[PDB]
């Protein structure tokens, strides 16, 4: 899983 | 420095259930652990300190126990709101560190998208780019196949797809697909289809138009 | 009311030098250490440093080098600063404070900073209509917000007015290396001849504010 600025959530 | 390892990765549950996140240590922390929870676009929010300790204006809904280096942040009753990240970060040894977190999904009844199609703007069209946006609106779940299709000729590689994350009211997704080509592509050109594919419905849903009605 | 709150979202060239503000309230920079923590892709949370009541700094150990903290009690700010800065720092920068004054269980955030470490230029947005079109009495329609750089661009509806049935996509990049984003609401198909739609988009990395009506085409 990866953080992602876009949403400022998990991205898995 | 203290490795904090958090299992499993993806939480996925119904609304109501119980839910538990894990957060283990690399080695012993006493008690010395606070859990935080991110949702869509905010900064994390603080839910119980040292291991077990409420906060205040945080839900009872939410608990922590544990020491040692086997620690639990449980969700007695799961609602849609709650869908969000968990994070654990120990403070018993210098630097404080954080875990790789926690992604809590919800389940929910299946809903099928509605689709809207949206042509370029004669604005966009100065601009000698053409943008074709296909809207799929408030779905579960979230698979979902957009085909692009130009005079019957389908369309591959020259669009990009978005999602939503998770609606924290009804639980549901949206997805923008976006076909952008050439003005001179999209000036040759007459029939603008898109195509969407889902659980939720019994035939795939073709939304259309003419350039120039 | 405790609050921190955070100078605007930046570009900076590789090598070159960061500085975040952090302006607080509700409490008093001489009773309170200001903690800063990033967010990355790659590293997740990681806690960088604090500036202590007394002016005391902590820096966390592989930052000892390239990072200064400092503040200004009587002004309630904080000053963060990174020097050297490569690609793998782009980030969300947050400024945080704890539940008492020596502790590290952190109660109050700022909303965050994402600093964009790249060599490229600024470039402001341009904002198209998704115009409703002739479902049920409920009728959508959005704003497409194309070819900016670096992220974020904000948008809302009805300067704030309007929030229900709002979804704004997350932001894709487009192989040109501009960032893409649209911004949907679906709404009454009979207001439509009553009340104005428009999406008020910033983009403050370029100072790009654009107010973009949107209406169902002729």
């Known amino acids: 899983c990866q953080f992602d600025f876009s949403t400022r959530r998990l991205k898995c | 420095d203290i490795l904090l390892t958090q299992s499993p990765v993806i939480l996925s549950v119904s609304p109501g259930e119980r839910v538990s996140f894990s957060c283990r240590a690399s080695?012993?922390?006493?008690?010395?652990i606070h859990w935080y929870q991110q949702r869509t676009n905010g900064s994390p929010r603080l839910l119980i300190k040292?291991?077990?300790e409420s906060i205040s204006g945080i839900p009872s809904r939410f608990s922590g126990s544990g020491s040692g280096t086997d620690f639990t942040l449980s969700i007695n009753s799961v609602e849609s709101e709650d869908i969000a990240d968990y994070y654990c970060?120990?403070?018993?040894?210098?630097?404080?560190?954080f875990g790789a977190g926690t992604k809590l999904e919800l389940k929910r009844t299946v809903a099928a998208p509605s689709v809207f199609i949206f042509p370029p703007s004669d604005e966009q069209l100065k601009s000698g780019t053409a943008s074709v946006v296909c809207l799929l609106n408030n779905f579960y779940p979230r698979e979902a196949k957009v085909q692009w299709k130009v005079d019957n000729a389908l369309q591959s590689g020259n669009s990009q797809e978005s999602v939503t994350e998770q609606d924290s009211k009804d639980s549901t997704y949206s997805l923008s697909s976006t076909l952008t080509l050439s003005k001179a592509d999209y000036e040759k050109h007459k029939v603008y289809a898109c195509e969407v594919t889902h659980q939720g419905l019994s035939s795939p849903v073709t939304k259309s138009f003419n350039r120039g009605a | 009311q405790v609050q921190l709150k955070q100078s605007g979202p930046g570009l900076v060239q590789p090598s070159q030098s960061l500085s975040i503000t952090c302006t607080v309230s509700?409490?008093?920079?001489?009773?309170?250490?200001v903690h800063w923590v990033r967010q990355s892709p790659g590293k997740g949370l990681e806690w960088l440093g604090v500036?202590?009541?007394?002016?005391?700094?902590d820096y966390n150990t592989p930052f000892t080098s390239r990072l200064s903290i400092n503040k200004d009690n009587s002004k309630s700010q904080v000053f963060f600063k990174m020097n050297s800065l490569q690609s793998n720092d782009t980030a969300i920068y947050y400024c945080?404070?704890?539940?008492?004054?020596?502790?590290?269980?952190?109660?109050?955030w700022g909303q965050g900073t994402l600093v964009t470490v790249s060599a490229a230029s600024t470039k402001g947005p341009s904002v198209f209509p998704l115009a409703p079109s002739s479902s049920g009495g409920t009728a959508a329609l959005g704003c497409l917000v194309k070819d900016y750089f670096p992220e974020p661009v904000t948008v809302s509806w009805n300067s704030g007015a309007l929030t229900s049935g709002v979804h704004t996509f997350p932001a894709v990049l487009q192989s040109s290396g501009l960032y893409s984003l649209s911004s949907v609401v679906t709404v009454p198909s009979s207001s439509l001849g009553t009340q104005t739609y428009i999406c008020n988009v910033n983009h403050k990395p370029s100072n790009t504010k654009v107010d973009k009506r949107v209406e169902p085409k002729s």
């Open positions: 945080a404070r704890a539940l008492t004054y020596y502790d590290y269980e952190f109660a109050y």
């Open positions: 509700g409490f008093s920079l001489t009773n309170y250490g």
């Open positions: 500036i202590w009541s007394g002016g005391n700094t």
């Open positions: 080695q012993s922390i006493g008690t010395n």
């Open positions: 040292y291991a077990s």
């Open positions: 970060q120990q403070n018993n040894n210098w630097p404080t560190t």
